[PDB]
């Protein structure tokens, strides 16, 4: 009997600064369990299913949320990608590949698989290139979206169980109850949102001028997104209609990174702490060193994923002579070490 | 007795609202189909024709909804196939014959009982060549799939494996006549309004003599479909042969502002009744006043996504409420005012 507060508390341990995103998942997860729990033999018939669309900046933690969810989730979960999908039975891949991947996690249990959750990454890769209907067939893009429409609403797709032993049959897999979380970092969406959010004005004398968009306000700008803007970006309205809900993720700032290095249990700081714990050596991270990493992380425009480059670059010299070194019990990383002027202080004990 | 067009439509009215034109067309075909089968066919009139239906309507107008509601009341077997996965010449994707075997699963492998079944093919527009494309490579999911359905719709015998085959020992197929099978092929066509305008607008008019069309008040999209003809679809990509097999057409009359309000209250499967049951098990009931729904209708039409895009308006409001509702105790009723939809205020909570 999980609750949004309990599930959010668990997710909060691994994610920070995504209060709006977390609420959406908690409701769907809570409602999905509630929907399946219901016998369906009641006044409410064919209860609706709310899908989710996770849009956010690069490296903001979208892919991480789906991974952490599967650990806590009891029902099966699968994480596919739309990069390999090709329409019309081409050589690349078919959409049915997503369903068979779910059974691998579910051990080929049809009744248990229909109640599963699905996640897709890099959904923007199939958006039309800001054009009108094409003059030719776009195998990857407009074509792929057309195929997913019926899958999201609910239908049965042929799937060989285990790939087939040697049977010549396929197992029907309902999808009316399956939830879908399609999310990927869209590029350039702010420029499109800027045009629509801005009222617009005529350049002549009589036409009034409107002073707006003084600051980019990226995080606050994506919140004003609507389906009509995505149509101009390349998505088909049919595909978005299948995804009523949407999630806007703020971009992490200098202060957000500091909390990510200490509060989460799987933080990189704690990883190295365990790396040296087995070696009989302790590790420490002072606040002055984390402040400098934040400024360097933003300088590389890579997000949280670009943080390891800064850490490994500093501890490189240390890690080269640490195993051979003996009688060392503690390592401290100061602010100077990041700049490279100094070396990390080692204590012998 | 037999089901009547008026009686069958009343059943559909419970699940569909504002589609009087479409309901009648479907009722007649279903009644005609039952009539043709009921008839022995060994009479003066023979080789009776089958009138197929072609449903053209915008997204979320209720095309897919009609097929599901029909199968519930319909006694004969029904299937919901799609032309998106079909590939011609037996390629690796899928074959057109797959539609037939799916029908038998509902019919329990009864050939005589299967020919009288009904089929609904969605996403039919997605297999049309748009225009002026490279001819070095032939279309596999475009111009080449419609050709395969021509013989199927007109009536031919297609080999089908029985149950997929227990082992190689059988190595046999089943022959199923399809001349009697009905086909309802419909999908939301994109960009059809632009081609129809060229024929019925003739108003670029930059010269003195030519007129000006008074642009921004003539884009009557829904009404524009009402004047559709087969020649317009040829420019869209459909082959005349495929259209000849589908004489009937049914404009959908997509949506009226007031229709959306009726869909949320009168239907049994309305969204309002869904959430009402969602909280009913939790010992909580929520009411939606009419003053709140009028604002919701205006927000949905602004999104240009149809009824399917309506949940976005509801869940965006009730997000914070549903997140902190279980933790709350002694709460028996919730009221949602117009302000809640706007976001200025919060939904009032009642304590028992
Ligand atoms: N809030 C966060 N707290 C802790 N680690 C985070 C956070 N956000 C991102 N990360 C780190 O970023 C890694 C990858 O996050 P992702 O979910 O891939 O971000 P992303 O924006 O989804 O990148 P994409 O989807 O591949 S473009 C995780 O394994 C974490 O190490
Ligand atoms: N007349 C209607 N009355 C009630 N609900 C409707 C009506 N029309 C559409 N809906 C809602 O819209 C949902 C989907 O409608 P569809 O039948 O899928 O429309 P559609 O034309 O098939 O869209 P496509 O072709 O699948 S993109 C239904 O499940 C209903 O919730």
Our CA angle for B287, A37, A154, nearest 5°, is: 85
Grouping H, G, I as helix, E, B as strand and the rest as coil, residue B248 is coil
Main-chain phi, psi angles of A303, to 5 degrees: 75, -160
Q: Does A158 contact B98 at a Cβ distance shorter than 8 Å? A: yes
Tell me the technique behind this structure: cryo-EM
Grouping H, G, I as helix, E, B as strand and the rest as coil, residue B177 is strand
Q: In 3D, which of A72, A65, A166, A177 has the Cα closest to residue A119? A: A65
Longest pairwise C-alpha distance within chain A? 81
DSSP string over B35-66: HHHHS-S-SSS-S-----EEEE--TTSSHHHH
DSSP state of B285: E
Residue indicated by tokens 């927000």? B299
- Kind of pairing between the strands at A77-81 and A52-55: unpaired
Cα A188 from Cα A233, distance rounded (Å):
9
The CA distances from residue A305 to A71, A234, A261, in Å, are: 21, 28, 12
Q: In 3D, which of A210, A72, A60, A87 has the Cα closest to residue A144? A: A87
**Where does residue A20 rank: exposed (0-12), middle (13-18), buried (19+ CB within 10 A)?**
middle
- CATH assignment of B254-352, among 3.40.109.10, 3.40.50.970, 1.10.8.60, 1.20.90.10: 1.10.8.60
Domains B1-253 and B254-352 agree in fold: no
B/e letters for A51-88, b = 16+ CB within 10 Å, e = fewer, are bbbbbbbbbbbbbbbbebbbeebebbbbbbbbeebbbb
Grouping H, G, I as helix, E, B as strand and the rest as coil, residue B127 is helix
Looking from the CA of A13 toward its CB, the CA atoms found within 13 Å total: 11
List ligand 1's pocket residues with C-beta within 6 A: A 15-17, 56, 58-64, 121, 185, 260, 264, 304-305
CATH fold, domain A251-349, is Helicase, Ruva Protein; domain 3 (1.10.8)
The CA distances from residue A299 to A27, A59, A61, A62, B174, in Å, are: 37, 14, 19, 22, 68
Cα B231 from Cα A90, distance rounded (Å):
32
What is the best residue among B308, B311, B313 to mutate for testing ligand 2's pocket, by most ligand atoms within 8 Å of CB? B308
**Where does residue A255 rank: exposed (0-12), middle (13-18), buried (19+ CB within 10 A)?**
exposed
Q: In 3D, which of A114, A136, A17, A25 has the Cα closest to residue A72? A: A25
Cβ neighbours of residue A177 closer than 8 Å, sequence gap 6 or more: A35, A36, A49, A114, A115, A154
Residue from A139, A151, A244 to probe the interface with B (highest B Cβ count within 10 Å):
A244
Task: Show the tokens assigned to B221.
Answer: 């999209």
Q: Tell me the domain boundaries of chain A.
A: 1-250, 251-349
In chain B, DSSP finds a helix count (H) and a strand count (E) of: 15, 10
Cα A220 from Cα A251, distance rounded (Å):
10
Per the CB < 8 A criterion, the answer to whether B248 and B32 are in contact is: no
Q: In 3D, which of A72, A64, A70 has the Cα closest to residue A105? A: A70
Per the CB < 8 A criterion, the answer to whether A303 and A59 are in contact is: yes
Task: Show the tokens assigned to B30.
Answer: 């279903």
Q: In 3D, which of A169, A30, A152 has the Cα closest to residue A98? A: A152
CB of A50 within 8 Å of any CB in chain B? yes
Cα A183 from Cα A56, distance rounded (Å):
8
Q: Check: CATH 3.40.50.620 for B1-253?
A: no
Cα B339 from Cα B292, distance rounded (Å):
8
Longest pairwise C-alpha distance within chain B? 80
The minimum-distance atom of ligand 2 relative to the CA of B58 is: 21
Q: In 3D, which of A217, A215, A218, A237 has the Cα closest to residue A226? A: A237
The minimum-distance atom of ligand 1 relative to the CA of A59 is: 21
CATH fold, domain A1-250, is Rossmann fold (3.40.50)
Grouping H, G, I as helix, E, B as strand and the rest as coil, residue A232 is helix
Distance A317 CA to ligand 1 centre (A): 28
Cβ neighbours of residue B7 closer than 8 Å, sequence gap 6 or more: none
Our CA angle for A79, A82, A87, nearest 5°, is: 130
Q: Quick one: which H or E segment has residue B102?
A: helix B98-107
B/e letters for B116-140, b = 16+ CB within 10 Å, e = fewer, are bbbbbbbbbbbbbbeeebeeeeebb
Cα B170 from Cα B168, distance rounded (Å):
6
Q: How many CB atoms lie within 10 A of CB B171?
A: 8
Task: Report resolution (Å) to 1 decimal.
Answer: 4.1
Grouping H, G, I as helix, E, B as strand and the rest as coil, residue B239 is coil
Our CA angle for A116, A120, A122, nearest 5°, is: 175
- Nearest-CB residue to A238 (from B59, B85, B133): B59
Q: How many CB atoms lie within 10 A of CB B308?
A: 22
Q: Measured from the CB, is residue B57 less than 6 Å from ligand 2?
A: yes
Our CA angle for A25, A30, A36, nearest 5°, is: 125
Looking from the CA of A259 toward its CB, the CA atoms found within 13 Å total: 12
Q: In chain A, which among 137-196 make CB contacts under 8 A with chain B?
A: 137, 143, 146-147, 149-150, 153, 155, 158, 167-170, 172
- Nearest-CB residue to A237 (from B59, B126, B129): B59
Task: Show the tokens assigned to A14.
Answer: 């691994």
Cα A330 from Cα A281, distance rounded (Å):
5
Distance A205 CA to ligand 2 centre (A): 47
Per the CB < 8 A criterion, the answer to whether A256 and A57 are in contact is: no
**Where does residue B18 rank: exposed (0-12), middle (13-18), buried (19+ CB within 10 A)?**
buried
């Amino acid at each position: 009997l999980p609750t949004p507060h309990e599930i959010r508390n668990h997710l909060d341990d691994y994610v920070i600064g995504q209060e709006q995103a977390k609420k959406v998942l908690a409701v769907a997860v809570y409602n999905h369990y509630k929907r399946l729990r219901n016998g369906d033999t009641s006044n409410g018939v064919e209860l609706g299913k709310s899908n989710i669309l996770l849009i956010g900046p690069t490296g903001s933690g979208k892919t991480l949320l789906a991974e952490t969810l599967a650990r806590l989730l009891d029902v099966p979960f699968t994480m596919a990608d739309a990069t390999t999908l090709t329409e019309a039975g081409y050589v690349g891949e078919d959409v049915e590949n997503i369903i068979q991947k779910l059974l691998q996690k579910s051990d080929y249990d049809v009744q248990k698989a229909q109640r599963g959750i699905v996640y897709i990454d890099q959904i923007d890769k199939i958006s039309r290139k800001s054009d009108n209907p094409s003059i030719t067939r776009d195998v990857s893009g407009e074509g792929v979206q057309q195929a997913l429409l019926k899958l999201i609403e609910g239908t049965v797709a042929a799937v060989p169980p285990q790939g087939g032993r040697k049977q010549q049959e396929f197992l029907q897999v309902d999808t009316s109850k399956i939830l879908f979380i399609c999310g990927g970092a869209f590029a350039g969406l702010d420029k499109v949102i800027s045009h629509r959010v801005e009222t617009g004005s005529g350049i002549g004398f009589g036409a009034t001028v409107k002073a707006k968009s003084d600051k980019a306000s990226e995080g606050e700008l994506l919140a004003q997104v609507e389906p009509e803007d995505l149509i101009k970006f390349g998505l088909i309205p049919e595909f978005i209609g299948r995804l009523p809900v949407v999630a806007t993720l703020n971009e992490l700032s200098e202060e957000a990174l500091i909390q990510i290095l200490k509060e989460p249990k799987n933080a990189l700081t704690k990883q190295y702490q365990a790396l040296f714990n087995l070696e009989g050596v302790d590790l420490e991270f002072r606040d002055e060193a984390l402040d400098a990493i934040a400024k360097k992380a933003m300088a590389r425009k890579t997000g949280a994923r670009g943080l390891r480059s800064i850490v490994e670059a500093a501890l490189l010299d240390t890690m080269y002579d640490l195993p051979s070194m003996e009688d060392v019990e503690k390592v401290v990383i100061d602010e100077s070490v990041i700049d490279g002027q100094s070396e990390p202080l080692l204590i012998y004990g």
